[PDB]
């Protein structure tokens, strides 16, 4: 009986891919053949935020575009003032194995997680004046790979399970569970409206999720290996992923298909993190080779290189105002380029 | 050109800097050990001797270890193994009685860990649990069922030496890392003494490299 189930699964896949092929009337390389090349993008290290003594695995900007949180496996989660390179806070984590960090849009809370399976929430603004853990969200059976706040009360997280989860921070239970993946979920990008979020997994697929019904809207495939990073285009209707194969891919939700591949013969290593400029014309990507390549997102031409790092560029961040780009790497430095 | 509050903020940042420096100095005191191994209880006995990560801190002979167990992580190792690049050493627990086979999968795990790119120069502390149960099994049934190419007698010592050789020879890079081996059924302080000795040797090597003598 299972053979028949595999049979109509296969024919459904055939029909879906046939429709997707039908939709592929053109690609960006055709209609964007006429636009002006962005040209060389010379960026300088305007700041070099120092103080971490181990690998920096995640950083996240604040909505004010000045305060940024960075997490390192030295056991610390430092809240930095970007403009003056000052350390606003330094939260000591209970578990040093942290591979994600979030900064609440309101700026009241931060979150972190990793191999402990717990998404800790830290209350920055307290009457005592010290940052205190407010709620430890537990229930995942795998490492927390990514976590993004929706509100002060809700948070969406991706785990080393095949699942993501939406949690109510006030009560601590999993408001929703997202189950569809078949491999480790490594990254998670929240849409600008926060209604939907994408998640890239080690099954070489990126899945689109609807927050309020726990159901997968769409599945995107095409990567040759596990997807380490994912980020929405500022529209919220498209997103870019990077994988251990030396390519980034730009997927669009409405066309439900892969649009552009950002690859080069020289690059033979994985992409650790990905980000978009404010306008989306520049796609920033950090690499295992000790660099961050800036890609012309419309032409797929490499626009520039941020070469000032001594180890893997684990994390990237572009401010909401798009004034600067922060690159955090395993050399324990956190550079702000402009 | 700095306001009073800006100077105070800079002072706070310097205080955080010195606190971070002290925390880093204290962290360098620690010896990081990664615990790995097949079997649901083989590493449990070792943890007794001393979900997600469970850390078992312990100070032995003034040296403060920090052993992290990853047995509870049912996820792809290659995504998070690199978190332990700087781990001082890896304890690898294998039960000798698993030669019924589970021992071959333990060999595969050891091969994938020892030859991992991240663990290019992190010495492995190999433990061979259950030598008494291995004695029982080996006087019950032969080891040839596990290793058909085995060309030694049925005696316990020969089988143990053969298993040690099979596990050690998986190390393709003998010039950068070492495999310390121990039969760990003693159920006494000898296990902590052995891991302490291996860690002392690793620290001496790291100090020689840092001083430029190696």
């Amino acid at each position: 009986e299972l053979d028949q189930l595999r049979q109509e699964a296969e024919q459904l896949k055939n029909q879906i891919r046939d429709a997707r092929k039908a939709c592929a009337d053109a690609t960006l390389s055709q209609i964007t053949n006429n636009i002006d090349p962005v040209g060389r993008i010379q960026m300088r290290t305007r700041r070099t935020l120092r103080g971490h003594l181990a690998k920096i695995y995640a950083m996240h900007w604040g909505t004010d575009s000045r305060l940024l949180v960075s997490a390192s496996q030295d056991g610390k989660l430092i809240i930095w003032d970007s403009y003056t390179t000052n350390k606003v806070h330094a939260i000591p984590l209970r578990s040093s194995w942290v591979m994600t960090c979030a900064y609440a849009p309101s700026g009241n809370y931060v979150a972190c997680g990793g191999l402990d399976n717990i998404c800790s929430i830290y209350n920055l603004k307290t009457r005592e004046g010290n940052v205190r853990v407010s709620r430890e969200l537990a229930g995942h059976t795998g490492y927390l790979s990514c976590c993004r706040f929706l509100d002060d009360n809700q948070i969406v997280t991706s785990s080393g399970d095949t699942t993501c989860a939406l949690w109510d921070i006030e009560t601590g239970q999993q408001t929703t569970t997202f189950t569809g993946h078949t491999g480790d979920v490594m990254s998670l990008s929240l849409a600008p409206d926060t209604r939907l979020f994408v998640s890239g997994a080690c099954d070489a697929s990126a899945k689109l999720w609807d927050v309020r019904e726990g159901m997968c809207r769409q599945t995107f495939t095409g990567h040759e290996s596990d997807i380490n990073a994912i980020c929405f285009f500022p529209n919220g209707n498209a997103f870019a992923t990077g994988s251990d194969d030396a390519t980034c891919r730009l997927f669009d939700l409405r066309a439900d298909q892969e649009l552009m591949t950002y690859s080069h013969d020289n690059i033979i290593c994985g992409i650790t993190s990905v980000s978009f400029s404010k306008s989306g014309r520049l796609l920033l990507a950090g690499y295992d080779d000790f660099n961050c390549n800036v890609w012309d997102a419309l032409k797929a031409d490499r626009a520039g290189v941020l070469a000032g790092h001594d180890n893997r560029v684990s994390c990237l961040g572009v401010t909401d105002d798009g004034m600067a780009v922060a690159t955090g790497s395993w050399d324990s430095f956190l550079k702000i380029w402009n | 050109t700095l306001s009073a509050e800006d100077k105070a903020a800079v002072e706070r940042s310097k205080m955080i800097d010195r606190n971070l420096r002290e925390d880093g100095e204290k962290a360098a005191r620690e010896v990081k050990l990664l615990l790995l191994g097949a079997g649901e209880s083989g590493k449990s006995t070792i943890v007794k001797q001393m979900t997600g990560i469970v850390e078992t801190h312990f100070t032995f002979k003034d040296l403060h270890f920090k052993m992290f167990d990853v047995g509870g992580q049912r996820s792809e190792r290659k995504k998070w193994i690199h978190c332990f690049e700087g781990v001082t050493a890896i304890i690898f627990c294998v039960a000798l009685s698993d030669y019924d086979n589970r021992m071959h999968e333990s060999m595969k795990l050891f091969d994938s860990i020892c030859n991992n790119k991240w663990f290019t120069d992190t010495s492995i502390i190999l433990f061979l649990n259950k030598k008494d149960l291995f004695e029982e099994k080996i006087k019950k049934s032969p080891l040839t069922i596990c290793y058909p190419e085995y060309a030694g007698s049925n005696t316990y010592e020969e089988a143990a030496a053969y298993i040690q050789c099979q596990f050690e020879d998986l190390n393709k890079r003998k010039d950068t890392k070492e495999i310390y081996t121990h039969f760990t059924c003693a159920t006494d302080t000898k296990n902590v003494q052995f891991v302490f000795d291996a860690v002392t040797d690793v620290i001496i090597k790291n100090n020689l490299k840092d001083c430029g003598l190696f």
Partner: single-chain antibody
Amino acid sequence: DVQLVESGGGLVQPGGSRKLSCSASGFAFSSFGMHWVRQAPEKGLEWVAYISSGSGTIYYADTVKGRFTISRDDPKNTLFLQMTSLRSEDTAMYYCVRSIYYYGSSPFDFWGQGTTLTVSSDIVMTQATSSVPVTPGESVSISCRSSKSLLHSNGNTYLYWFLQRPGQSPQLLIYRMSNLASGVPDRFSGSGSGTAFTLTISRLEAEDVGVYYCMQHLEYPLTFGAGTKLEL
């Protein structure tokens, strides 16, 4: 809850010495810098001394330099003001004020109850109005002016508005002339141009009657204005 209690006040012969002690509880006392602020009888607040977190930087008023010494000790969560050669015009009720400095912080947020002491046998901040009568229900505006522009180059202005209800310690209403302090009702608001500043209350519930003070934090010595009184 956060609590600062002062002790060591009393009657002291002029020319004597006395140590004021501030016991702190309910917050990470070591993180906070601390201030001392006198209020002589029927007089406005007046800054005395400042001890930064970690006891790194010290500041004093020119009227207490040399004679007074501000100190702390974090392990017992206590602040001290040693006072020597007490002259007559040191008769005042001393406030122990808490203050944290980082981006987006709220300095002078909490004030202790204060201890009374009776000795017996620079940017100038101005407030024109006083003893302003107000029936409850409508809105009022109080004005404070500074001789030197309080807008710093970095772009944040440093006027602080405090409210002192009668028989109670002052509390922070506004910090940096725009930001409402935590727990303060939204009706209070601050505005102004870099040299002249105003605080407006939309609805004047009787609980908020009292004296409103303005303080500059651009540069030491910190200077309060003669507060404007609002009465029913």
